[PDB]
């Protein structure tokens, strides 16, 4: 009725556990995007904030495992292509070379959408080598799988 | 290549053809909104509007001269480097000749625009150092041209009373050979008479002010403006003008331009003859039908000692006229000749000076040459008291605009046919009715003003105006006190007529039109001056050679211009034209002040809103199907990421997806046409909000990969079972 399967249910607790530290038995609000993303999920912080405002009317940040499960069951059908994320970069390219200016990346990733923080875009950069960045080499990197 | 657009980070609206609604309100408020963000350059199609910042702006960087290198207009924000680029590429690839026409009120930066056009060109033409061997002589020559061609009017303390052309000459490879300077349409009338509050040309006041008494005693002069008729008593010292200093700056500039001190000394002798030549008075001979006669011969004697001419021949010249015999001149006819000899000696010397500079940087070699030139003609003038002088400036601005509004309209109609798009007759303002009203050779003002000066009878200003009133009455662009508007305005007084220009109605005063139009240089004066001992004075008057045909002259003054404006429109047409509309935001030379009042006047003067209606021409936006898709394909989920190819049908199905009506656009054979900007701003807004979803996509995916990678690595290190 989730609708989900056990071998999945195997995969998720492994991840659920180590974020559940207290033994009080739940992950914090802020502990859901990092455990979502940790298993093949790429959710927008808006989607995450929606989820929070749904479960938590308890005035604290707590989530049970079945509601967790039923928070992970629809999102598998939420496919996200690669030629999309490839074009999303090409939109931000002065040329069509495939090399993106490291500044116009920091500018975009920090002025548009769900703004990334100063430390996010620095370490995103140091993972993407070298004044420029081969965003076509960065997408295979993040989408080889 | 590059995939940019001027619509990106657009402050206000860069190309005023995207203006909606198009009224003067929204126009002034857009060159103010931009101005406050230091965006002084704005486009009307291929035209740049330059509002003076009155400071240095960091947009004239070397990184720009390359950012704007070999790029179309829309590919980057508006900037004067986009006009200089079009010019250079057209010069370079088409072997065309380039004229750049700069129009506006003095102080608008027309001196600065031309310096930024030519300093771009030097940076990209490869042979920059050789180019700047020319921009420096043209600079060091400026203070002389100004002294002889600029003057203080009731609104500009340094206004240029002539048309200015300069160019730089390359060969058909790109190697620069030299330059030229041309002078146009000099206000010769200003020498002999000036209005009140205004001032004669600079060089007269610079000479008497800062010539050492020793130098004033070689020329029969004296430091006293109250002693000279061609100079004014009160209006002879200007705020923050040290003519003494300027004279040292004009004496230096000649030295470095290449004047032997004999040459220079013989130049300042002729400024001294002309100044003292207006001191000669005449009185009737024993006089109802009698003759004329000098009053005094002292100042005449000095002129002859100085000029080395023969008093007997000038005495006879100012009084008689040998033609066909030797008829004697009336007193009025004799003053008209003392003046005609003055202004036709100043102009001939100024034009002489210009061609003495060009000898320096004339292109030695006789090979074909391309031209990169700038024409800085003088701004429209609506004064409190408008006279004959302003008539020319405004008639010149009307010839140039009509030539431009039709060229611009011709080329837009020539594009709507390339793309199989229908034409819609633009109910615009045909400027030709005012030109015809003026320069017609039958019912013109010029012809009927000349025709009152050809009468031996007695003709004053009120007969010429009551001539206009008789024949110019029914011309809807001519209104006077007895001619006949249906608007509730106070009636016009006598001795004035008003006509409607493309820049608005201007009220002209008739006092002087007959005197300022008598430019009678009859041969007895050219001949008496060809008999001079002055190597210069005898060189300005070649018709004084008895050998040369005794034919005629330019019979009139308005005639002498209608021909001088004709040779300009005829030269300017043989060239590839681009235009810069230079604008002053404040009279007070202030950096960051913008007066909607003063700028709006210039919006009229420059005729800017007709340019927008003319260049809009129905459809205001057009873009080739390829970039129009690569830019907006991300708006429907059928073009993203591809395609639909090819582009015309991908764009078609894109618009029929955004539910935008079909009346709002049209399909050209290469470009898509959009009528109103309000659509293009809807597409460029959706794009702004779609890209906020592409960023969020990259952001959401980098966060997932960074956390999923941080987790498996971690739980791969669980090998501590």
Curated annotation (Swiss-Prot), chain A:
Q: At what positions is N6-methyllysine found?
A: 115
> Glycyl lysine isopeptide (Lys-Gly) (interchain with G-Cter in SUMO2) crosslink - at what positions?
21
Which amino acids does the record list as binding Ca(2+) 3? 93, 95, 97, 99, 104
Q: Is Signal there in the keyword field?
A: no
The chain residues annotated with the modification N6,N6,N6-trimethyllysine are 115
Region annotation Necessary and sufficient for interaction with PCP4: residue ranges? 76-145
Main location group:
cytoplasm
Q: Fetch the InterPro entries from UniProt.
A: CALM/Myosin/TropC-like, EF-hand-dom_pair, EF_Hand_1_Ca_BS, EF_hand_dom
Modified positions (Phosphothreonine) are 44, 110
User: Keyword Calcium on this protein?
Assistant: yes
- Residues recorded with modification Phosphotyrosine: 99, 135
Quote the entry's note on domains.
The N-terminal and C-terminal lobes of CALM bind to the C-terminus of KCNQ1 in a clamp-like conformation. Binding of CALM C-terminus to KCNQ1 is calcium-independent but is essential for assembly of the structure. Binding of CALM N-terminus to KCNQ1 is calcium-dependent and regulates electrophysiological activity of the channel. The C-lobe interacts with KCNN4 channels in a calcium-independent manner, whereas the N-lobe interacts with the S4-S5 linker of KCNN4 in a calcium-dependent manner playing a role as calcium sensor and gating the channel.
For this entry, the protein name equals Calmodulin-1
- Which organism encodes this protein? Homo sapiens (Human)
Q: Name the gene behind this protein.
A: CALM1
From Swiss-Prot, chain B:
Q: What top-level branch of life does the organism fall under? A: Eukaryota
Q: Which residues bind ATP?
A: 104-111
Indicate the cross-link positions, Glycyl lysine isopeptide (Lys-Gly) (interchain with G-Cter in SUMO2): 283
Q: Where is this cross-link: Glycyl lysine isopeptide (Lys-Gly) (interchain with G-Cter in SUMO1)?
A: 283
Where does the record place the IQ domain? 691-715
Q: Name one GO biological process term.
A: endocytosis
- Annotated Myosin motor domain residues: 11-688
Q: Does the keyword tRNA-binding apply?
A: no
What one GO molecular function would you report for this record?
actin filament binding
Could you tell me which residues carry Phosphoserine?
56
Q: What Gene Ontology cellular-component terms does the record carry? A: actin cytoskeleton; actin filament; apical part of cell; brush border; cell periphery; cytoplasm; early endosome; endosome membrane
Please give the residue ranges the record annotates as the region Actin-binding: 579-586
Asked whether the keyword Translocase is assigned, the reply is no
List UniProt keywords, sorted A-Z. Actin-binding, ATP-binding, Calmodulin-binding, Isopeptide bond, Motor protein, Myosin, Nucleotide-binding, Phosphoprotein, Repeat, Ubl conjugation
Similarity comment: family membership: Belongs to the TRAFAC class myosin-kinesin ATPase superfamily. Myosin family.
Function statement: Motor protein that may participate in process critical to neuronal development and function such as cell migration, neurite outgrowth and vesicular transport.
Q: What is this protein called?
A: Unconventional myosin-Ib
> What species is this protein from?
Rattus norvegicus
Q: Which gene encodes it?
A: Myo1b
């Amino acid at each position: 009725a989730d609708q989900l399967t056990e071998e999945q249910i195997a995969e998720f607790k492994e991840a659920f556990s180590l974020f559940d530290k207290d033994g009080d038995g739940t992950i914090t609000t802020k502990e859901l995007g990092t455990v979502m993303r940790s298993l093949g999920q790429n959710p927008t912080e808006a989607e995450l904030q929606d989820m929070i405002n749904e479960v938590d009317a308890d005035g604290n940040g707590t989530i049970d495992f079945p509601e967790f499960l039923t928070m992970m069951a629809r999102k598998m059908k939420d496919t996200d292509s690669e030629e999309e994320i490839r074009e999303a970069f090409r939109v931000f390219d002065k040329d069509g070379n495939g090399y993106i200016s490291a500044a116009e990346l920091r500018h975009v990733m920090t002025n548009l959408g769900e703004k990334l923080t100063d430390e996010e875009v620095d370490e995103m950069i140091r993972e993407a080598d070298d004044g420029q960045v081969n965003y076509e080499e960065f997408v295979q990197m993040m989408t080889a799988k | 290549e590059v995939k940019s657009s001027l619509l990106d980070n657009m402050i206000g609206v860069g190309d005023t053809v995207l203006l909606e609604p198009l009224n003067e309100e929204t126009f002034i408020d857009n060159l103010k909104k931009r101005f406050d963000h230091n965006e002084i350059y704005t486009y009307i199609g291929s035209v740049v509007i330059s509002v003076n910042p009155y400071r240095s702006l960091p947009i004239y960087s070397p990184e720009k001269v390359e950012d704007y290198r070999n790029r179309n207009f829309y590919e980057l924000s508006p900037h004067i480097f986009a006009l200089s680029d079009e010019a250079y590429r057209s010069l370079r690839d088409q072997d065309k000749d380039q004229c750049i026409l700069i129009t506006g009120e003095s102080g608008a930066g027309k001196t600065e625009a031309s310096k930024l056009v030519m300093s771009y060109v030097a940076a990209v033409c490869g042979k920059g150092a050789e180019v700047n061997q020319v921009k420096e002589q043209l600079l060091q020559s400026t203070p002389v041209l100004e002294a002889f061609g600029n003057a203080k009017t009731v609104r500009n303390d340094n206004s240029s009373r002539f048309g200015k052309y300069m160019d730089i000459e390359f060969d058909f490879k790109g190697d620069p050979l030299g330059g030229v300077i041309s002078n146009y349409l000099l206000e010769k009338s200003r020498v002999v008479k000036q209005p009140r509050g205004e001032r004669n040309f600079h060089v007269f006041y610079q000479l008497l002010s800062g010539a050492s008494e020793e130098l004033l005693h070689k020329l029969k002069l004296e430091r006293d403006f109250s002693r000279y008729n061609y100079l004014s008593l009160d209006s002879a010292k200007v705020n923050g003008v040290d003519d003494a200093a300027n004279f040292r700056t004009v004496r230096n500039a000649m030295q470095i331009v290449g004047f032997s001190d004999p040459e220079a000394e013989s130049v300042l002798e002729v400024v001294a003859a002309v100044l003292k030549l207006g001191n000669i008075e005449f009185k009737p001979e024993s006089r109802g039908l009698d003759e004329s006669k000098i009053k005094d011969k002292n100042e005449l004697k000095e002129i002859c000692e100085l000029t080395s001419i023969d008093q007997v021949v000038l005495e006879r010249a100012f009084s008689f006229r040998t033609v066909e015999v030797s008829t004697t001149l009336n007193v009025a006819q004799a003053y008209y000749a003392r003046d005609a000899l003055a202004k036709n000696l100043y102009s001939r010397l100024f034009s002489w000076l210009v061609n003495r500079i060009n000898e320096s940087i004339k292109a030695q070699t006789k090979v074909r040459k391309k031209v990169m030139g700038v024409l800085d003609i003088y701004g429209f003038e609506i004064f409190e008291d408008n006279s004959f002088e302003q008539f020319i400036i405004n008639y010149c601005n009307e010839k140039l605009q009509q030539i431009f509004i039709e060229l611009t309209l011709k080329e837009e109609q020539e594009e709507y046919i390339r793309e199989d798009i229908e034409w819609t007759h633009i109910d615009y303002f045909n400027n030709a009715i005012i030109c015809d009203l003026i320069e017609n050779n039958t019912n013109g003002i010029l012809a009927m003003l000349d025709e009152e000066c050809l009468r031996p009878g007695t003709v004053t200003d009120e007969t010429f105006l009551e001539k206009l009133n008789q024949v110019c009455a029914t011309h809807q662009h001519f209104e006077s006190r007895m001619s006949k508007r249906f608007l509730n305005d106070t009636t016009l007084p006598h001795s004035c007529f008003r006509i409607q220009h493309y820049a608005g109605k201007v009220l002209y005063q008739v006092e002087g039109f007959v005197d300022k139009n008598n430019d009678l240089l009859y041969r007895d004066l050219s001949q008496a001056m060809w008999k001079a001992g002055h190597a210069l004075i005898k060189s300005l008057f070649p018709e004084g050679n008895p050998a040369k045909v005794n034919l005629k002259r330019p019979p009139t003054a308005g005639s002498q211009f209608k021909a001088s404006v004709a040779t300009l429109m005829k030269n300017l047409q043989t060239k590839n034209p681009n235009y810069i509309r230079c604008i002053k935001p404040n009279d007070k030379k202030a950096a960051h002040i913008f007066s909607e009042s003063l700028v709006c006047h210039q919006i009229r003067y420059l005729g800017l809103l007709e340019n927008v209606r003319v260049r809009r021409a129905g459809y205001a936006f057009r873009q080739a199907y390829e970039p129009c898709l690569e830019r907006y394909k991300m708006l429907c989920k059928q073009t993203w990421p591809h395609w639909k190819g090819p582009a015309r049908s991908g764009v078609e199905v894109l618009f029929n997806e955004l539910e935008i009506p079909v009346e709002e656009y049209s399909f050209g054979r290469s470009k898509i046409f959009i009528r109103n900007p309000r659509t293009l701003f809807q597409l460029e807004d959706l794009r702004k909000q779609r890209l906020e979803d592409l960023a969020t996509l990259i952001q959401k995916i980098y966060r997932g990969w960074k956390c999923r990678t941080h987790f498996l690595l971690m739980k791969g290190l669980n090998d501590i079972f």
